[PDB]
Amino acid sequence: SYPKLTGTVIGTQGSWNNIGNTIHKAFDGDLNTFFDGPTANGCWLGLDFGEGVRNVITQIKFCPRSGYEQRMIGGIFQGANKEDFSDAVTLFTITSLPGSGTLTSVDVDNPTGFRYVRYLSPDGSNGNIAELQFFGTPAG
Ligand SMILES: [Ca+2]
């Protein structure tokens, strides 16, 4: 069990109907608060660990938005070393309905060190996710 990783929150700007459920709601420790993106499609969020910082990812945990758990199916998690994710690799693909009101934990088996990680949401989701956490260790 490796430590939870910290970084700068990156991703889609804004929120649905300008209510204020921005990407930051996925990193606040509250499973009741969620990201609700401004558009149905294209929403994403994640971390930049910082210039010169690369982590090997060993585990990801996530919690869906309550009542909208199906909006995570088909979402993927990616690691990259370009902020545009053009070099990205998929670390995990959500294929089953996540349980409500809890963190689902998934193992990652990829030895690559990444500066950037993200959740890339499927069409029709508004990016909906309540909490997102990455675990791992500095790349050797
Ligand atoms: Ca939250």
Q: Tokens 């030895």 sit at which residue? A: 111
Burial class (CB in 10 A: 0-12, 13-18, 19+), 96: exposed
Distance 92 CA to ligand 1 centre (A): 21
Beta bridge partners of 43: none
Cα 117 from Cα 15, distance rounded (Å): 21
Do 113 and 55 form a contact (C-beta atoms < 8 A)? yes
List the CATH number of the domain containing 134: 2.60.120.260
- Cα(46) to ligand 1 centroid in Å equals 13
* Other CB atoms within 10 A of residue 17 CB: 9
Q: How far is the CA of 140 from the centre of ligand 1 (A)?
A: 31
The count of domains in the chain is 1
Distance 89 CA to ligand 1 centre (A): 25
- Tell how far the Cα of 23 is from the centroid of ligand 1, in angstroms: 9
Experimental method: X-ray
Pull the structure tokens for residue 28. 């606040």
Neighbouring residues of 33: CB distance < 8 A, sequence distance ≥ 6? 21, 25, 130
| CB distance 9 to 47 below 8 Å | yes
Resolution of the PDB structure in angstroms: 1.6
How many C-alpha atoms does 61 have within 13 Å on its Cβ side? 18
Among 88, 90, 11, which Cα is nearest to 44's?
11
Between CA 113 and CA 136 the distance in angstroms is 10
Q: Which of 138, 120, 112 is nearest to 5 (CA)?
A: 138
Amino acid code (one letter) for 30: D
- Longest CA–CA span in the chain (Å) reads 44
Domain of 41? Answer: 1-140
Apex 22 CA angle, 47 and 46, nearest 5 = 15
DSSP letter at 110 equals: -
Ligand 1 centroid – CA 127 distance (Å): 13
Distance separating alpha carbons of residues 31 and 12, to the nearest angstrom: 20
